[PDB]
């Protein structure tokens, strides 16, 4: 299963940086054990040579994450942005991405990586959810992420 | 650098046994997926099974001909892989190889579990199944 | 499960394609290898355009439907030997398989 928690939600301030932003999404990852405790500094190493922006048409969207043996139990983590803020392309495209939603994968095997990134891809085509992510505070996006995680558990 | 060596290859009766090993250096072998595969003699490359890494809680997966005759098992603190081989055939003979295994997806074209390569191959132990 | 020709041959400097098809390859890439008799396998390329470090820029995989394909551009006498694909056995798959093989023969 994918551990979810309501503090594993946050609206992020302006003058946030890259960085700060995985390091942020990454603490309350670190304070409840689901990582090893350096495990931002994984992600940013990732992120430098494996980007995660995703160019889709509400705004944008990011999915930094690192190595499986980085992790110690299945969690996510999310952040929305105040402004964008841009992530270099995951499909190797010369146009940075501003991105304002950022989902942080700290998966700990391979077969759950992969059908969590399936998963990314679906829904990250609902426009309308991801409007909804930049609108409803931190417990709506809770309730919302962790009803669409239970179904994807369910099958 | 990657240094894959296959022991253990010999010459042995139908029905009997045999256990391969696969010495690995020049890499991190603990966080390492490690596959056999092997080449009947004059037939081509065939996957005999592989075992993942401990997020995956080391599970095996098996190659329909070999299920329940052959056990891949791994030994971390020394960096071995092994096959061990009971009830043996002659379409067992051939050469085995021990290959570190990749794993690929790609997020926008992708579709789970993703793929599998394999990246260092070793020479191969020669195993002949004979009467 | 993967399908490749049994032998294909090209004259010395050519480009040449060789093929691997199976329903499998719909949804997962392929990955190539070269073989040479008293040779380990070498990995030649897999995914969706990745070439390790160190294989000569003329092999080159692609992919449509449910074919991978790997061309030679300007096959040299070295490159013969025995090509094989591998991917999922089935869609979703946690198996892996290896198509029949290919002997390229390079007409040196």
């Known amino acids: 299963g994918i551990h979810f928690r309501r503090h594993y939600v946050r609206h992020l301030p302006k003058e946030v940086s890259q960085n700060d932003i995985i390091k942020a999404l990454a603490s309350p990852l670190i304070n409840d054990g689901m990582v090893v405790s350096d495990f931002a500094d994984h992600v940013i190493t990732r992120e430098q040579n494996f980007p995660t922006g995703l160019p889709v048409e509400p705004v944008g969207v990011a999915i930094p994450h690192t190595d499986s043996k980085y992790v110690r139990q299945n969690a996510i983590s999310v952040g929305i942005l105040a402004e964008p803020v841009n992530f270099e392309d995951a499909g190797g495209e010369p146009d940075p991405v501003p991105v304002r939603v950022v989902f942080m994968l700290a998966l700990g095997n391979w077969f759950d990586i992969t059908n969590v990134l399936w998963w990314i891809k679906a829904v990250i085509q609902d426009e309308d959810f991801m409007q909804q992510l930049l609108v409803m505070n931190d417990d709506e996006i809770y309730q919302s992420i962790y009803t669409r995680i239970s179904e994807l558990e369910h099958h | 650098e990657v240094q894959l060596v296959e022991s253990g290859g010999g010459l042995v009766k139908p029905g009997g046994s045999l256990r391969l090993s696969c010495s690995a250096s020049?890499?991190?072998?603990?966080?390492?997926?490690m596959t056999w595969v092997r080449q009947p003699p004059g037939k081509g490359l065939e996957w005999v099974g592989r075992?993942?890494?401990?997020?995956?809680?080391?599970?095996?997966d098996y190659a329909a001909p070999v299920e329940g005759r052959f056990t891949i098992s791994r030994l971390n603190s020394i960096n071995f892989l092994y096959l061990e081989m009971n009830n043996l055939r002659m379409e067992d003979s051939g050469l085995y190889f021990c290959?570190?295994?990749?794993?690929?997806?790609?997020?926008?074209?992708?579709?789970?579990?993703?793929?599998?390569?394999?990246?260092?191959w070793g020479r191969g132990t020669l195993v002949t199944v004979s009467s | 499960e993967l399908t490749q020709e049994t032998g294909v041959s090209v004259a010395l400097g050519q480009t040449v394609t060789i093929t691997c098809q199976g329903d499998?390859?719909?949804?997962?890439?392929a990955s190539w290898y070269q073989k040479k008799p008293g040779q380990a396998p070498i990995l030649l390329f897999y995914?969706?355009?990745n070439r390790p470090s160190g294989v000569p820029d003329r092999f080159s995989g692609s992919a449509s439907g449910n074919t991978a394909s790997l061309t030679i551009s300007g096959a040299q006498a070295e490159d013969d030997a025995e090509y094989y694909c591998?991917?999922?056995?089935?869609?979703?798959?946690?198996?892996?398989?290896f198509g029949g093989g290919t002997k390229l023969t390079v007409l040196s």
């Open positions: 290959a570190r295994t990749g794993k690929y997806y790609d997020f926008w074209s992708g579709y789970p579990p993703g793929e599998e390569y394999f990246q260092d």
């Open positions: 020049g890499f991190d072998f603990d966080n390492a997926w």
């Open positions: 075992i993942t890494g401990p997020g995956e809680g080391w599970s095996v």
């Open positions: 499998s390859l719909r949804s997962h890439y």
């Open positions: 995914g969706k355009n």
């Open positions: 591998s991917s999922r056995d089935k869609s979703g798959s946690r198996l892996s398989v």
